Each structure stands twice: as C-alpha cells, then as structure tokens.
Amino acid sequence: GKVFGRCELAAAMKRHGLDNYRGYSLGNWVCAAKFESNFNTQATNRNTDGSTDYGILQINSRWWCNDGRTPGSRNLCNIPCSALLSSDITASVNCAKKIVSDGNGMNAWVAWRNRCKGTDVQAWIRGCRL
C-alpha cells in the first residue's frame, strides 16, 4: 500500500504531465486527491447505487473503469478498477487525463468542485521540489 505526501504526489503528478494539463494547474490535482482520498492510493468507496470509487482520485466504475459489478459500465479508461488501487499512480493519472479529454472538467470530481475550485490551489504545491 501507499499513502502519499503532498509534495511527493505533486512531483509524481508533474512527471506525468498534469501541471496545466487541459488548463488545470498542478495544485488543482493535488487538492483533488487530498479531499478525495487523503492521498491514500487504496481508498475505496462503495456506493449504494452499485458503483464504486477507486484510488487516490476516487474514479468511478460506472463510466471510467471496469469492476464487473457496476450497472451501465462504459469502461472509458479501458482499465480494471484494480489498476486504480496501485501504489504507482500511472493508471489513476492516465484515467484522470481521459476524463478531462472526454469533455468533463475537474467538476467530475465532487471533492474538487466542493473543496478546491476557486481557492488558492497553488498552496497545495507551495514549498515542494518540482
């Protein structure tokens, strides 16, 4: 397992191209992870509706990843949801990119919309080596 630190996650996300990706500066992505999962790569939220949110960015199994148990599955990231529980952030970052590339803002992430949008998101990367 793994729980990231803020700056460790910022650096990994930047190595994966997230700083300014589709108009979202790096702190947006760190803030989203903070409030979605508290940086826990294995965070898993199982919803009454039968879908589940997986990993550090709490990506959902209806549209985005396949867990084989969710009605209406589209698997638009073309990954098993297990890949979103990895200690390495590859699948989560690539799927987060795909979400935005499929026409969704960051507003897809409830924690970003509710905790991060409009704030000084740069604070989430302040003092980090990048």
Given resolution (angstroms): 1.0
Please report, to the nearest 10 degrees, the dihedral formed by the alpha carbons of residues 63, 67, 72, 77 taken in order: 30
CA distance 71 to 68: 9
CA distance 113 to 105: 10
CB burial class (10 A; 0-12, 13-18, 19+) of residue 106? buried
CB crowding 56-92: b at 16 or more within 10 Å, else e = bbbbbbbbbbbbeebeebebbbebbbebbbeeebebb
The amino acid occupying position 110 is V
Does 102 count as an annotated binding residue?
yes
Chain mean position to CA 44: 12
Q: Which of 36, 49, 67, 88 is catalytic?
A: 36
> Does residue 8 carry a catalytic annotation?
no
- The Cα angle at residue 78 between residues 106 and 38, in degrees rounded to 5: 45
CA distance 130 to 127: 9
Q: Which of 8, 19, 53, 88 is catalytic?
A: 53
